[PDB]
Amino acid sequence: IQSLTARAPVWLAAQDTLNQLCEQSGETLASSNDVTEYMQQLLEREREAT
């Protein structure tokens, strides 16, 4: 329970900032590999823009 509790606020902060970062992005995120996929898409778009 203590381990789960020490991990509880960390998890909650992760979820909070995850939702915020998801909303800052047009596409909605659902999984870790999905997050990295979106990240590489972002790098691609950045290269084209520059």
């Binding site: 870790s32 590999n33 990295t36 990240m39 590489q40 790098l43 290269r47």
Partner: protein, 49 residues
């Protein structure tokens, strides 16, 4: 004779640009498929311990 040199030099420069572009593509592919566990501590060591 003059234009031959320009063709050669242009060939080399275009090759270089393509190399750079593909290098960026490789890094992007990498981060797309890789960051979830990048640069983490070695498990062989800890399992041995």
């Amino acid at each position: 004779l003059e234009r031959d040199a320009l063709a050669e030099r242009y060939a080399t420069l275009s090759f270089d640009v393509q190399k750079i572009q593909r290098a960026h593509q490789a890094f992007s592919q990498f981060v797309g498929k890789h960051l979830s566990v990048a640069f983490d501590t070695d498990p062989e060591a800890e399992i041995r311990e």
